[PDB]
Write an enzyme that holds these catalytic residues in place. Structure first.
Site, PDB file in Angstrom:
ATOM      1  N   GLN A 166       0.848  -1.203   0.000  1.00 11.86           N
ATOM      2  CA  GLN A 166       0.000   0.000   0.000  1.00 11.86           C
ATOM      3  C   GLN A 166       0.879   1.247   0.000  1.00 11.86           C
ATOM      4  O   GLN A 166       1.824   1.405   0.773  1.00 11.86           O
ATOM      5  CB  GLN A 166      -0.966  -0.051   1.188  1.00 11.86           C
ATOM      6  CG  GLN A 166      -2.332   0.612   1.034  1.00 11.86           C
ATOM      7  CD  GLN A 166      -2.381   2.064   1.470  1.00 11.86           C
ATOM      8  OE1 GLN A 166      -1.383   2.775   1.413  1.00 11.86           O
ATOM      9  NE2 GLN A 166      -3.540   2.546   1.948  1.00 11.86           N
ATOM     10  N   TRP A 233     -10.820  -2.248   8.358  1.00 13.75           N
ATOM     11  CA  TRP A 233     -10.700  -2.011   6.916  1.00 13.75           C
ATOM     12  C   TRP A 233     -11.262  -3.209   6.158  1.00 13.75           C
ATOM     13  O   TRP A 233     -10.810  -3.553   5.051  1.00 13.75           O
ATOM     14  CB  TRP A 233      -9.253  -1.634   6.516  1.00 13.75           C
ATOM     15  CG  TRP A 233      -8.979  -0.209   6.974  1.00 13.75           C
ATOM     16  CD1 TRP A 233      -8.215   0.128   8.059  1.00 13.75           C
ATOM     17  CD2 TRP A 233      -9.447   1.015   6.410  1.00 13.75           C
ATOM     18  NE1 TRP A 233      -8.177   1.501   8.196  1.00 13.75           N
ATOM     19  CE2 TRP A 233      -8.931   2.072   7.195  1.00 13.75           C
ATOM     20  CE3 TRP A 233     -10.264   1.358   5.316  1.00 13.75           C
ATOM     21  CZ2 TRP A 233      -9.195   3.426   6.925  1.00 13.75           C
ATOM     22  CZ3 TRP A 233     -10.530   2.697   5.037  1.00 13.75           C
ATOM     23  CH2 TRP A 233      -9.992   3.711   5.846  1.00 13.75           C
ATOM     24  N   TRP A 275      -4.410   5.360  -8.340  1.00 19.73           N
ATOM     25  CA  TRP A 275      -5.721   5.436  -7.691  1.00 19.73           C
ATOM     26  C   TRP A 275      -6.599   6.520  -8.331  1.00 19.73           C
ATOM     27  O   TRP A 275      -6.105   7.610  -8.642  1.00 19.73           O
ATOM     28  CB  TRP A 275      -5.598   5.770  -6.208  1.00 19.73           C
ATOM     29  CG  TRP A 275      -4.763   4.940  -5.276  1.00 19.73           C
ATOM     30  CD1 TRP A 275      -3.785   4.032  -5.550  1.00 19.73           C
ATOM     31  CD2 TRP A 275      -4.869   4.965  -3.834  1.00 19.73           C
ATOM     32  NE1 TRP A 275      -3.274   3.503  -4.381  1.00 19.73           N
ATOM     33  CE2 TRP A 275      -3.924   4.060  -3.307  1.00 19.73           C
ATOM     34  CE3 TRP A 275      -5.673   5.685  -2.941  1.00 19.73           C
ATOM     35  CZ2 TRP A 275      -3.761   3.843  -1.943  1.00 19.73           C
ATOM     36  CZ3 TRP A 275      -5.516   5.470  -1.572  1.00 19.73           C
ATOM     37  CH2 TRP A 275      -4.569   4.557  -1.077  1.00 19.73           C
ATOM     38  N   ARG A 284     -21.330   5.786  -3.022  1.00 23.71           N
ATOM     39  CA  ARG A 284     -21.795   4.979  -1.887  1.00 23.71           C
ATOM     40  C   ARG A 284     -23.122   5.513  -1.367  1.00 23.71           C
ATOM     41  O   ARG A 284     -23.386   6.715  -1.425  1.00 23.71           O
ATOM     42  CB  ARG A 284     -20.750   4.977  -0.766  1.00 23.71           C
ATOM     43  CG  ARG A 284     -19.463   4.242  -1.139  1.00 23.71           C
ATOM     44  CD  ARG A 284     -18.433   4.250  -0.023  1.00 23.71           C
ATOM     45  NE  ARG A 284     -17.217   3.493  -0.333  1.00 23.71           N
ATOM     46  CZ  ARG A 284     -16.184   3.454   0.506  1.00 23.71           C
ATOM     47  NH1 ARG A 284     -16.200   4.125   1.662  1.00 23.71           N
ATOM     48  NH2 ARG A 284     -15.099   2.744   0.161  1.00 23.71           N
TER      49      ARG A 284
HETATM   50  C1  LIG Z   1      -0.506   8.113   6.418  1.00 31.67           C
HETATM   51  C2  LIG Z   1      -2.030   8.092   6.207  1.00 31.67           C
HETATM   52  O1  LIG Z   1      -2.782   8.187   7.166  1.00 31.67           O
HETATM   53  N1  LIG Z   1      -2.505   7.925   4.961  1.00 31.67           N
HETATM   54  C3  LIG Z   1      -3.959   7.765   4.634  1.00 31.67           C
HETATM   55  C4  LIG Z   1      -4.211   6.528   3.736  1.00 31.67           C
HETATM   56  O2  LIG Z   1      -3.998   5.355   4.543  1.00 31.67           O
HETATM   57  C5  LIG Z   1      -5.636   6.585   3.161  1.00 31.67           C
HETATM   58  O3  LIG Z   1      -5.861   5.472   2.242  1.00 31.67           O
HETATM   59  C6  LIG Z   1      -6.753   4.444   2.693  1.00 31.67           C
HETATM   60  O4  LIG Z   1      -5.989   3.584   3.595  1.00 31.67           O
HETATM   61  C7  LIG Z   1      -6.786   2.446   4.105  1.00 31.67           C
HETATM   62  C8  LIG Z   1      -5.957   1.747   5.164  1.00 31.67           C
HETATM   63  O5  LIG Z   1      -5.506   2.663   6.170  1.00 31.67           O
HETATM   64  C9  LIG Z   1      -7.239   1.668   2.938  1.00 31.67           C
HETATM   65  O6  LIG Z   1      -6.120   1.036   2.282  1.00 31.67           O
HETATM   66  C10 LIG Z   1      -8.080   2.514   1.954  1.00 31.67           C
HETATM   67  O7  LIG Z   1      -8.512   1.780   0.799  1.00 31.67           O
HETATM   68  C11 LIG Z   1      -7.246   3.707   1.481  1.00 31.67           C
HETATM   69  O8  LIG Z   1      -8.080   4.550   0.655  1.00 31.67           O
HETATM   70  C12 LIG Z   1      -5.869   7.890   2.374  1.00 31.67           C
HETATM   71  C13 LIG Z   1      -7.258   8.099   1.799  1.00 31.67           C
HETATM   72  O9  LIG Z   1      -7.290   9.265   0.965  1.00 31.67           O
HETATM   73  O10 LIG Z   1      -5.616   9.012   3.270  1.00 31.67           O
HETATM   74  C14 LIG Z   1      -4.264   9.045   3.816  1.00 31.67           C
HETATM   75  O11 LIG Z   1      -4.132  10.212   4.586  1.00 31.67           O
HETATM   76  O1  LIG Z   2     -20.723   0.176  -3.630  1.00 26.72           O
HETATM   77  C1  LIG Z   2     -19.770  -0.559  -3.879  1.00 26.72           C
HETATM   78  C2  LIG Z   2     -18.593  -0.622  -3.052  1.00 26.72           C
HETATM   79  C3  LIG Z   2     -17.438  -1.415  -3.551  1.00 26.72           C
HETATM   80  N1  LIG Z   2     -17.385  -1.820  -4.909  1.00 26.72           N
HETATM   81  C4  LIG Z   2     -16.247  -2.657  -5.431  1.00 26.72           C
HETATM   82  O2  LIG Z   2     -15.353  -3.007  -4.351  1.00 26.72           O
HETATM   83  C5  LIG Z   2     -14.093  -2.276  -4.480  1.00 26.72           C
HETATM   84  C6  LIG Z   2     -13.606  -1.841  -3.064  1.00 26.72           C
HETATM   85  O3  LIG Z   2     -14.273  -0.632  -2.664  1.00 26.72           O
HETATM   86  P1  LIG Z   2     -13.584   0.792  -2.727  1.00 26.72           P
HETATM   87  O4  LIG Z   2     -12.685   0.799  -3.911  1.00 26.72           O
HETATM   88  O5  LIG Z   2     -14.681   1.834  -2.645  1.00 26.72           O
HETATM   89  O6  LIG Z   2     -12.686   0.843  -1.380  1.00 26.72           O
HETATM   90  P2  LIG Z   2     -11.454   1.892  -1.122  1.00 26.72           P
HETATM   91  O7  LIG Z   2     -10.278   1.438  -2.047  1.00 26.72           O
HETATM   92  O8  LIG Z   2     -11.945   3.261  -1.512  1.00 26.72           O
HETATM   93  O9  LIG Z   2     -11.102   1.670   0.316  1.00 26.72           O
HETATM   94  C7  LIG Z   2     -14.438  -1.151  -5.479  1.00 26.72           C
HETATM   95  O10 LIG Z   2     -13.278  -0.708  -6.224  1.00 26.72           O
HETATM   96  C8  LIG Z   2     -15.369  -1.887  -6.450  1.00 26.72           C
HETATM   97  O11 LIG Z   2     -14.720  -2.767  -7.374  1.00 26.72           O
HETATM   98  C9  LIG Z   2     -18.445  -1.550  -5.778  1.00 26.72           C
HETATM   99  O12 LIG Z   2     -18.454  -2.026  -6.918  1.00 26.72           O
HETATM  100  N2  LIG Z   2     -19.577  -0.926  -5.254  1.00 26.72           N
END
Ligand SMILES: CC(=O)N[C@@H]1[C@@H](O)[C@H](O[C@@H]2O[C@H](CO)[C@H](O)[C@H](O)[C@H]2O)[C@@H](CO)O[C@H]1O
Ligand SMILES: O=c1ccn([C@@H]2O[C@H](COP(=O)(O)OP(=O)(O)O)[C@@H](O)[C@H]2O)c(=O)[nH]1
Ligand SMILES: [Mn+2]
Length: 287
Positions: A166, A233, A275, A284
């Protein structure tokens, strides 16, 4: 017959982590010899699969850009099958595909909570592996739809079990990782344990291995439901517990799944996937 040194040279990237303590490579731009690998896998005639889910307005926001970019950049030079899972097939964007790409589409039930749409992927992917994907491909990737391919994502990424670092956490200490920290959850990882923080937006492997990854994660999701708890998560918390117990045989650097909101620092040399900006107010429909 492949040997690691045939294709992987860690000394090309001396200032980042290129090898784990259990001797798995971390694949960074510069370390891989794609020509060597394209010749090796072509002679075996492999096919590679890719699953992607889009439920609700994730279809209109993300599915076309995901598939158009996958067509251009994913495993070019080898046969690929895209498996698309949607709740409404009438909204599926039917783009033109290029040489060695093909697809098929399945209608799935939309779960009521976005959290369950994300977690139920684990159940659905395993069902599809048993019914058909195991007969169709040599390796499978399972990906989020809210991201875009930006450059070649090729056979240097293939392996028995493959994990993604990540982007926000790859230089951090494990006690700072956002693992599930409540001992009542199946996904619990104690302080003092952990190797890396893996992103659930990309994982893969042979069909046999991905079946085990998805089956074990879904068992954990179901156990938590019976104990009235939901991991911080969601499926990503369970995936991190899995890969702690069953170490991945290959890891991808954050160049393979980068967040440009961070900027572009020296360690990220060529981005293969980025991303999408989050849009939760629209895509959502529950908190
Ligand atoms: C250092 C920090 O806090 N960064 C956060 C990111 O972790 C965050 O991304 C999300 O992270 C969670 C796990 O913590 C998960 O992987 C989510 O899918 C991911 O989007 C990000 C969101 O914009 O903000 C940063 O500040
Ligand atoms: O309403 C929903 C929520 C999730 N997803 C699927 O599940 C994945 C994981 O969700 P999301 O990407 O929103 O999580 P994030 O990466 O933002 O934490 C998405 O990319 C989609 O492929 C979707 O199709 N519809
Ligand atoms: Mn996502």
């Amino acid at each position: 017959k492949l040997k690691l040194s045939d294709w992987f040279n860690p000394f090309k990237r001396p200032e980042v982590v290129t090898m784990t303590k259990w001797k798995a490579p971390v694949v960074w731009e510069g370390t891989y010899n794609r020509a060597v690998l394209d010749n090796y896998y072509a002679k075996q005639k492999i096919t590679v699969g890719l699953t992607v889910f889009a439920v609700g307005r994730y279809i209109e926001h993300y599915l076309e850009e995901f598939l158009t970019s996958a067509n251009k950049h994913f495993m070019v030079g080898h046969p690929v099958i895209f498996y698309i899972m949607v709740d409404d097939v009438s909204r599926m964007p039917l783009i033109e595909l290029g040489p060695l790409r093909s697809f098929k589409v399945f209608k799935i039930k939309p779960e009521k909570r976005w959290q369950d749409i994300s977690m139920m992927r684990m159940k659905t992917i395993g069902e599809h592996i048993v019914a058909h994907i195991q007969h169709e491909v040599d390796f499978l990737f399972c990906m989020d739809v809210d991201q875009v391919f930006q450059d070649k994502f090729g056979v240097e990424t293939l392996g028995e079990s493959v994990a993604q670092l990540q982007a926000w956490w790859y230089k951090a200490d494990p006690n700072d990782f956002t693992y599930e920290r409540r001992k009542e959850s199946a996904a619990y990882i104690p302080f003092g344990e952990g190797d890396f923080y893996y992103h659930a937006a990309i994982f893969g492997g042979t069909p046999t291995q991905v079946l085990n990854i998805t089956q074990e994660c879904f068992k954990g999701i179901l156990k938590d439901k019976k104990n009235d708890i939901e991991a911080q998560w969601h499926d990503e918390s369970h995936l991190n517990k899995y890969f702690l117990l069953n170490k991945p045989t290959k890891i991808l650097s954050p160049e393979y799944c980068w967040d440009y909101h961070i900027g572009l620092p020296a360690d990220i040399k060529l981005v293969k996937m980025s991303w999408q900006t989050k849009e939760y107010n629209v895509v959502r429909n529950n908190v």
